[PDB]
């Protein structure tokens, strides 16, 4: 009838409001669209990727422009330890005058938002200094976004439409991406660091108008071509160097000092340049591996076919897996999301402990925000990775094409995998909760010496082997006569051992029994989320309750009340269940990060050590104690700058609560209520003159699960972001 879901004739003939919702929700599932071919599917994905790249570049241009126009970047550059960086200006006509003065914060730029993204530290570290530089970067990124939009439009034209074989050329794409997208870009970033960022850190002004006449090193490129490369590591920055000035500055461009700059508490820029140079060489070498059209190189099909153990332990091995991966976009998406989310977690774990930007470790709100942001992003991406693995198993998996290889064999013992995951989750939950409750009862009965406080000796042993001498294990980097000590002693071990034996940074924090208990809680969260996702992926094709589940697709409401009842039996429902557990897991992780770092930043390390061993300590000394300033952002006596975070705190609590309605109450109540409402409209005079085009119906079962999950997740994120930013900002 209607024409909004033009890609789905079944949705377009839906006479209800479900057509609009499902038309929005299935818009980007291009494979299920009407009259879609494989080639047009790949071309649409290509153009959508161009659009996403343009959106990303426009977003970065917007951040740069708003900082350049309404921020205080030069003032922050002058005083990075005592100036709050400004995100953007506030123009709200609903503001009262005390709201105007509170968000001005005694400045002259009017009401502003104090940035927590850490773009100031990054842009200062990479050599930007003025508002003109940020504006030029924003204009350049807007132009780049427009170019990518044009390229997306251009490659949809019939002359420039790539063929299906072009999209399936795995060897050429891998070679080009590894050599140029990783290696050449890393080499160019080394060039930027050597020519611009390192001179700007030493008080030397290098821009486009003078970089052709400015020598990055006094000896030029002659030591590079002569092979005497150790010249570039000579005379590094001294420990008394002041960032952005020439005082204490060396002339080296590629070092391996290790540790941190003493003033900025961040990694040395010459170390970063040498890292990116070695990364560039390694990745350029790795991009010369696969055969394209030159007669040399590996074929990935031959590599996969050769790797089958001759004892038959893996069956057919990896035979036929090239066609499985290459023909399935959901397999590739699952692999990409798994790796990207793991890398996002690595980014979170490495930026707090090895801060790469100048004056980032002293910005506590920024560090907490960046860690929490990237860990929640990583959790969502891991959930998506397993979801698209399940979608691959439903939609793209061919059992006959994968006869006897590792995929079919891991499907053939899925009960063992799921049951062992269930066992490890049950063990971790039982014993972690039991130890926490035992310690809570010990603290309640006034006898904290009866607590079970297991020392994390394995992780302390790892810390000792990496050079932390506090725990008294004498091995490797903490053993002065060891070979590992003597090998790195002239290269990077002085700075590394200075940083790892100092308790004033976040490099390998001292750990105790509270760290043990929360790490086992994290393990329980990871294993349970994995169990839900893995069971959903492996039972996606079928179970004993529903042996023909592949015939019904990835997402469907149920199979009805028969056979005992089949609520939430689809693999989509397993994803939906696992989002709750992922949110709980990242909540535990970020709670741990924030409380341990709050105790470290306040100078009271013993607060975490003496209160994290029992859950009442967590509640009282972390949530209750640190919410006092946040919930006083506005009170009967007035308001302050934290009033926006108090309002968002309550906002997130409300959004979280509204999701419980969609998750607890289910459809048939609401459909009957809407039936009475539709009766009421038709029988009401002066209002039956107007009438609906789409018949009002209640939201579908799957749609309700999605909407409740979205409200739950949004409330979770908004509540914790408001609490984290307010509690870190009000004290620091």
């Amino acid at each position: 009838a209607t024409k909004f879901p033009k890609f789905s004739q079944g949705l377009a003939k839906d006479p209800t409001t479900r057509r609009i919702w499902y038309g929005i929700a299935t818009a980007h599932d291009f494979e299920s669209h009407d009259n879609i071919t494989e080639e047009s599917l790949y071309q649409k994905i290509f153009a959508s990727h161009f659009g996403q790249l343009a959106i990303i570049f426009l977003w970065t241009s917007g951040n740069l422009f708003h900082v350049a126009w309404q921020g205080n970047f030069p003032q922050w550059v002058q005083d990075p330890l005592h100036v709050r960086p400004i995100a953007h200006a506030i123009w709200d006509p609903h503001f009262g005058q005390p709201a105007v003065e509170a968000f001005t914060r005694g400045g002259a730029q009017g009401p502003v938002n104090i940035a927590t993204s850490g773009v100031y530290q990054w842009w200062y570290t990479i050599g930007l200094r003025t508002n003109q530089d940020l504006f030029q970067g924003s204009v350049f990124l807007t132009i780049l976004s427009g170019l990518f939009l044009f390229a997306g439009w251009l490659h949809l034209q019939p002359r420039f439409q790539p063929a299906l074989a072009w999209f399936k050329n795995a060897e050429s794409r891998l070679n080009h991406h590894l050599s140029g997208l990783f290696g050449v870009s890393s080499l160019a970033w080394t060039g930027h660091l050597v020519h611009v960022a390192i001179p700007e850190a030493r008080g030397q002004h290098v821009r486009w108008d003078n970089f052709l006449t400015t020598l990055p090193h006094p000896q030029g490129l002659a030591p590079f071509f002569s092979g005497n490369w150790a010249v570039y590591a000579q005379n590094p920055d001294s420990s008394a160097h002041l960032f952005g000035t020439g005082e204490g500055s060396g002339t080296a461009i590629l070092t391996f000092l290790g540790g941190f700059h003493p003033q900025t508490q961040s990694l040395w820029l010459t170390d970063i340049a040498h890292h990116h140079l070695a990364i560039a060489v390694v990745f350029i070498l790795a991009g010369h591996m696969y055969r394209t059209n030159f007669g040399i190189g590996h074929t990935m099909q031959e590599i996969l076919d050769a790797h089958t153990p001759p004892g038959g332990g893996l069956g057919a091995g990896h035979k036929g897996l090239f066609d499985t991966v290459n023909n399935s976009l959901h397999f590739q998406l699952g692999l990409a999301l798994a790796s990207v989310g793991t890398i996002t977690s690595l980014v979170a774990q490495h930026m707090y402990s090895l801060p790469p930007y100048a004056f980032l470790a002293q910005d506590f709100t920024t560090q907490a925000s960046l860690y929490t942001h990237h860990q929640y992003i990583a959790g969502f991406i891991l959930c998506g990775a397993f979801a698209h693995g399940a979608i691959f198993f439903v939609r793209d998996y061919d059992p006959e094409q994968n006869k006897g290889n590792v995929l079919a064999r891991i499907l053939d013992h899925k009960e063992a995998v799921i049951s062992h995951l269930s066992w490890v989750s049950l063990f971790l939950g039982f014993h972690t909760l039991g130890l926490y409750v035992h310690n809570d009862v010990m603290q309640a009965f006034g006898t904290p010496e009866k607590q079970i406080l297991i020392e994390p000796v394995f992780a302390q042993w790892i810390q000792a082997a990496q050079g932390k001498t506090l725990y008294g294990f004498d091995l490797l980097l903490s053993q002065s006569n060891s070979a590992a000590f003597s090998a790195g002693q002239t290269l990077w071990l002085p700075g590394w051992l200075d940083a790892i034996n100092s308790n004033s940074n976040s490099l390998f924090l001292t750990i105790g029994p509270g760290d043990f208990l929360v790490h086992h809680a994290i393990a329980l969260g990871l294993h349970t989320t994995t169990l839900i996702l893995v069971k959903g992926a492996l039972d996606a094709r079928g179970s004993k309750l529903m042996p023909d589940k592949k015939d019904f697709g990835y997402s469907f409401p149920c199979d009805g009340p028969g056979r005992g009842g089949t609520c939430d039996i689809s693999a989509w429902d397993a994803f939906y269940l696992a989002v709750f557990w992922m949110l709980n897991t990242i909540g535990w992780v970020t709670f741990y990060f924030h409380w341990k770092h709050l105790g470290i930043w306040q100078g009271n390390v013993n607060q975490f050590n003496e209160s994290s061993t029992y859950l009442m300590g967590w509640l009282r000394d972390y949530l209750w104690l640190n919410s006092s300033q946040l919930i006083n952002g506005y009170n009967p006596f007035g308001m302050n700058s934290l009033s926006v975070w108090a309002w968002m705190f309550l906002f997130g609590h409300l959004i979280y609560a509204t999701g419980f309605m969609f998750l607890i109450s289910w459809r048939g109540y609401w459909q009957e209520l809407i039936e009475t409402l539709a009766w009421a409209h038709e029988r009401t005079p002066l209002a039956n003159l107007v009438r609906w085009r789409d018949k009002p119906v209640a939201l579908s079962i799957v749609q309700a699960r999605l909407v409740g999950l979205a409200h739950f997740s949004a409330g979770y994120i908004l509540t914790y972001a408001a609490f984290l930013i307010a509690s870190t900002s009000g004290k620091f």
Partner: peptide, 20 residues
């Protein structure tokens, strides 16, 4: 270039990648 660069490191005083 690996041989020349490793020689330049072991010839420059103050640097010793050997484990003894």
């Amino acid at each position: 270039y690996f041989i020349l660069a490793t020689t330049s490191l072991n010839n420059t005083p103050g640097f010793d990648p050997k484990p003894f």
